[PDB]
Design a protein around this nucleic acid. Structure first.
Ligand SMILES: [K+]
Ligand SMILES: [K+]
Ligand SMILES: [K+]
Ligand SMILES: [K+]
Ligand SMILES: [K+]
Ligand SMILES: [K+]
Ligand SMILES: [K+]
Ligand SMILES: [K+]
Ligand SMILES: [K+]
Ligand SMILES: [K+]
Ligand SMILES: [K+]
Ligand SMILES: [K+]
Ligand SMILES: [K+]
Ligand SMILES: [K+]
Ligand SMILES: [K+]
Ligand SMILES: [K+]
Ligand SMILES: [K+]
Ligand SMILES: [K+]
Ligand SMILES: [K+]
Ligand SMILES: [K+]
Ligand SMILES: [K+]
Ligand SMILES: [K+]
Ligand SMILES: [K+]
Ligand SMILES: [K+]
Ligand SMILES: [K+]
Ligand SMILES: [K+]
Ligand SMILES: [K+]
Ligand SMILES: [K+]
Ligand SMILES: [K+]
Ligand SMILES: [K+]
Ligand SMILES: [K+]
Ligand SMILES: [K+]
Ligand SMILES: [K+]
Ligand SMILES: [K+]
Ligand SMILES: [Mg+2]
Lengths: 129, 82, 166, 212, 142
RNA sequence: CCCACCCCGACCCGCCAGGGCAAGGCUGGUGCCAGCAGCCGCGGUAAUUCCAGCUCGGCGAGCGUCGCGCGGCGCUGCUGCAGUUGAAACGCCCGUAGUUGGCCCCCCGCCGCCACGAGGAAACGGGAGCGCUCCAGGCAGGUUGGA
């Protein structure tokens, strides 16, 4: 059955961009997916999106501008102390200068730079670069 | 722009071209890449010398035949077609 | 037990992993020529003493510029590296530590210092003169070729007042 | 002297082309090795023979033997190349390999691990390469770390101008030609990866195009 | 995923590794305990015994030679071994009652080269090192 | 109590190698014999490998041999292996324990989780400061210090 909606969303988006598409539909939607797309947008990797209601689990329409080298999730959501972040940075990311590991903390969803800017830990949910 | 020194100087040897369709970098030894240019008449049905538009396409967009529609869509955005 | 059971001791050099590599085999003897080195161990020691000061900096550089560990240990490391003359004053950045070579360590040996001030014609004559108790550091007779001279104590390297060359 | 057989080689003979990076920027093939030799006059290129292999074809009367030679070239400052050649005599095989190595020159992009103080000193970011069963990973490294690779890979990384690098190799790397092929392919992809430094859109101006 | 995942599967991940560890020949040889029982030296670097005979042993297929060896009875467990004597002309220091110190050939209990059934070798005869006896540094009584 | 260290006075290498892995090549003897060789292999009366001479290589007051632990090894794989044909998907369906389980309310409680504290041992391990002549050390020292 369906377990990880975010994993399927990110696979669909990577496929659509690798083809060279302008838009892609991902279903279902969820609060976590909207948070992940909001972070991707604020870093500049995707354009506008739109969540369309259907009195069910909704759909999302995503606009693409060809800046996404890769995006994925980490399952299960291992927890990370503040000092192990860097031992993860040199594991998933192509460098120490660009790319983003996304954590959920008691201060919200955020990338790793802000996580060591607030010197806290959390649980890893995914990455894009 | 490209990669910078710590002071502000670009330490990059050259900047590859980007695809007009899929924004992907061209790269050297991609010999299926093509750059080509369009007249942009503007003058009572006759062209104007040395005033063109120019696009580029990487080999990935050509290998599947996506260029015939993407080039048309790009042209309809620059006032060269409709 | 006896009290001696509580005394510490440690090895101070690391041997290379592939012994029979030609380019570093002759690069390793140009070093034995420019400095009066007895044997390969005195090169190994040097590299070992580099490999620690390189491990510290890379640990602090992974950290943040405002943490107390950086502010404390990086300052200690730089203050120690400037007195021995292994690093010079104009480079007071922790990132200037990483590009250090062994030759910088070998240049502050007493055998090297006395050659620079021309007390000895060559480095081999310098080693011989060191063994003969013919040279003093700050009025103190030093017998060790491998002695490391601080920048404070490099104005004051001479022939010993008690000597047959005085 | 030499008379060009191609329009690009005819254009280089005059003062039309100023550097290799314009030929790479509009990615055209190079078919004469003296086009390359015009931009690198007399031994800014290092040329080293990696391997000579004896190959045998079985025949009614007995085995036929030939030689295969693998050659790498570079300038220590951002260009690498790799060719191969097959011939009856060893000298001609090496000659063919050196020519093919010169026609396969590619540019290599460098960058900074951590601090961005001076010249770029390591790979621009992680690079990956495949050839045959061999796979390779080039990982950026801090200053003073050196070239941590096998002696086969370390020479290609030395000719390329990369001072500091970490390396991992998987597959049957005892097969020397696939090892060098994988490292070469990894270096060749370095100028095709989108990084945020390159996102900014630009206008193409046809006046500069060398017109294929 | 061909391996179990999930935040509460540590017990399964440990059970699988414990079970599949025994499939490796190296681990099974070094950890099971049957090789320690069957080992003539009982897990030691060397062992002393008395010579019971002198023998010559044929080599294997592509070589042709007669290698020189001795049947040895072990003092500590009364087992029967055969041990090789290297270094030209050395079989002439081995009388039929000569305490011998015996070590391995390398390869941790596997035959080497072209000597069938030989896993041990003599290093000392009647108190004196055999190599120094060959190099003419010491000598036997008479 | 004697001695060692320190001060003043007068006398005064070796062990392994040299075909490849792996740095380093001519004469005599032996002729699938004697022997070498971790692995590839060497020796059949012209031997780059045996036994010797010369020369040369490596480490060095230290070198070689045997056994074991770790590394090599992503050949035990959590990070991170493999399962069409190389070794490997149960003949198939049901099914308990176990493992796993879509989307939605925020601003309560109870878990987990993250951070910061309190409390308990030193030696070891890191680490601030200090010229046992250097050093392995030690806790020194010239108002001090062992943070
Ligand atoms: K599998
Ligand atoms: K697997
Ligand atoms: K499984
Ligand atoms: K779970
Ligand atoms: K398993
Ligand atoms: K005398
Ligand atoms: K004397
Ligand atoms: K005298
Ligand atoms: K020998
Ligand atoms: K062995
Ligand atoms: K071997
Ligand atoms: K072999
Ligand atoms: K002969
Ligand atoms: K292993
Ligand atoms: K391991
Ligand atoms: K490993
Ligand atoms: K698999
Ligand atoms: K089978
Ligand atoms: K089977
Ligand atoms: K089978
Ligand atoms: K099955
Ligand atoms: K089964
Ligand atoms: K079943
Ligand atoms: K079932
Ligand atoms: K069921
Ligand atoms: K069940
Ligand atoms: K359950
Ligand atoms: K399970
Ligand atoms: K469960
Ligand atoms: K499930
Ligand atoms: K917790
Ligand atoms: K948290
Ligand atoms: K205590
Ligand atoms: K006080
Ligand atoms: Mg392993």
């Amino acid at each position: 059955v369906r377990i990880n909606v975010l994993r399927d969303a990110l696979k669909s988006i990577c496929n659509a961009q690798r083809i060279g598409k302008k838009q892609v539909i991902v279903r279902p939607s969820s609060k976590v997916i909207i948070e992940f797309l909001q972070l991707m947008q604020k870093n500049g990797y995707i354009s506008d999106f739109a969540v369309v209601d259907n009195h069910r689990s909704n759909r999302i329409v995503v606009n693409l501008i060809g800046r996404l080298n890769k995006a994925g999730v980490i399952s299960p959501r291992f927890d990370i102390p503040a000092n192990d972040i860097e031992k993860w940075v040199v594991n998933l990311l192509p460098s120490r200068l660009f790319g983003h590991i996304i954590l959920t903390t008691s201060q919200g969803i955020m990338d790793h730079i802000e996580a060591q800017h607030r010197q806290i830990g959390g649980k890893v949910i995914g990455y894009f670069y | 722009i490209g990669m910078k020194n710590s002071s502000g100087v670009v330490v990059d040897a050259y900047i590859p071209r980007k695809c007009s369709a899929t924004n992907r970098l061209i790269g050297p030894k991609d010999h299926a890449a093509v750059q080509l240019s369009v007249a942009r008449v503007n003058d009572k049905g006759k062209m104007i010398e040395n005033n063109y538009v120019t696009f580029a396409f990487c080999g990935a967009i050509r290998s599947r035949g996506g260029v015939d529609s993407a080039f048309m869509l790009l042209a309809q955005e620059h006032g060269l077609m409709e | 037990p006896r009290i001696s059971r509580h005394r510490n001791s440690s090895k101070t050099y690391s041997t290379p992993k592939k012994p029979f590599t030609k380019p570093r085999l002759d690069a390793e003897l140009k070093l034995c020529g420019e400095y009066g080195l007895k044997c390969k161990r005195e090169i190994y020691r040097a590299r070992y003493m580099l490999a620690k000061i390189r491990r510290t900096a890379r640990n602090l550089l992974t950290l943040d510029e405002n943490d107390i560990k950086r502010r404390f240990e990086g300052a200690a490391l730089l203050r120690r590296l400037h007195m021995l003359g292994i690093l010079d004053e104009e480079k007071d950045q922790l990132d200037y530590v990483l590009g250090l070579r062994i030759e910088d360590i070998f240049k502050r040996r007493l055998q090297s210092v006395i050659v620079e001030s021309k007390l000895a014609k060559s480095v081999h004559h310098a080693r011989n003169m060191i063994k003969a108790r013919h040279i003093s550091v700050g009025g103190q007779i030093v017998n060790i070729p491998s002695y490391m001279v601080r920048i404070s104590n490099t104005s004051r390297v001479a022939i010993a007042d008690t000597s047959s060359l005085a | 002297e030499w008379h060009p057989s191609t329009k690009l080689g005819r254009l280089v003979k005059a003062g039309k082309i100023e550097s290799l990076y314009d030929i790479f920027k509009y990615s055209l093939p190079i078919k004469e090795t003296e086009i390359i030799d015009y931009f690198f006059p007399k031994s800014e290129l290092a040329e080293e023979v990696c391997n000579i292999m004896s190959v045998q074809k079985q025949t009614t009367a007995g085995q036929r033997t030939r030689f295969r030679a693998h050659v790498i070239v570079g300038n220590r400052d951002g260009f690498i190349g790799y060719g191969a050649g097959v011939s009856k005599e060893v000298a001609n095989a090496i000659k063919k390999a050196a020519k093919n190595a010169r026609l396969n020159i590619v540019p290599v992009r460098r960058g900074f691990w951590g601090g961005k103080l001076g010249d770029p000193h390591t790979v621009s970011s992680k690079l990956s390469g495949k050839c045959g069963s061999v796979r390779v990973r080039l990982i950026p490294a801090p200053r003073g770390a050196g070239i941590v690779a096998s002696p086969t890979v370390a020479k290609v990384l030395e000719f390329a101008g990369v001072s500091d690098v970490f390396t991992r190799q998987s597959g049957h790397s005892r097969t020397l030609m696939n090892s060098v092929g994988a490292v070469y392919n990894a270096l060749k992809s370095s100028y095709s990866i989108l990084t945020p430094d390159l996102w900014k859109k630009e206008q193409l101006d046809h006046v500069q195009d060398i017109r294929t | 995923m061909s391996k179990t995942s999930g935040l509460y599967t540590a017990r399964k991940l440990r059970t699988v590794r414990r079970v599949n560890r025994w499939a490796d020949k190296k681990y099974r040889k070094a950890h099971l305990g049957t090789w320690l029982k069957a080992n003539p030296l009982e897990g030691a670097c060397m062992a002393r015994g008395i010579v019971t005979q002198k023998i010559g042993i044929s080599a294997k297929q592509p070589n042709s030679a007669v290698r020189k060896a001795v049947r040895v009875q072990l003092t500590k467990n009364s087992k029967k071994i055969t041990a090789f004597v290297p270094r030209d002309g050395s079989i002439t220091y081995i009388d039929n009652n000569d305490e011998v110190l015996v070590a391995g050939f390398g390869r941790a209990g596997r035959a080497v080269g072209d000597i069938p059934g030989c896993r041990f070798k003599v290093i000392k005869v009647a108190g004196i090192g055999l190599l120094a006896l060959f190099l003419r540094k010491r000598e036997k009584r008479a």
